[PDB]
């Protein structure tokens, strides 16, 4: 019973300048889908990826999972072109393909089996 809630609120953010990356308060998680548009041409667009141990705190304690990562990120690559993203952020699917539990070499193998189609997902590990 009742329609009590707050159906409208306001609180607007101005801000139309164009984001450039302008860092103090909070990092978002922008999830960003790095393709690599291979036709004709399979050259490294400059993002790459790491294969690292990530420490999580768990109910066993810090414990530490593979996880994977970017490993180098080349000038003029579209994950620098972002510029929100760096080396230290995190990887989650390639094309539609989650890198979650695979090894290194089968997330490359599966980003070359689809380069032509290619979609990196990548967030953010810049958390605040």
Same mark, same amino acid.
């Given at each position: 019973g009742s329609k009590t809630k707050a159906p409208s609120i306001s609180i607007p953010h101005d801000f139309r300048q @164009?984001?450039?990356?302008?860092? @103090?308060?909070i990092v978002p998680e922008?999830?960003?889908?790095?393709? &690599? &548009?291979?036709? $004709?041409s399979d050259k490294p667009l400059g993002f790459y990826i790491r294969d690292g141990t990530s420490v999580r705190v768990t109910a066993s304690g810090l414990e530490k999972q593979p996880g994977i990562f970017i490993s180098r990120l080349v000038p003029g690559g579209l994950a620098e072109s972002t $510029? +929100? +993203?760096?080396?230290?952020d995190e990887v989650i699917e390639v094309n539609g393909i989650?890198?979650? $539990?695979?090894t290194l070499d089968q997330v490359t193998d599966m980003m070359v089996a689809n380069s032509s189609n290619l979609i990196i997902t990548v967030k953010p590990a810049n958390q605040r």
């Open positions: @164009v984001s450039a990356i302008i860092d @103090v308060d922008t999830h960003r889908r790095v393709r &690599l &548009l291979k036709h $004709g $510029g +929100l +993203l760096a080396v230290n989650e890198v979650a $539990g695979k």
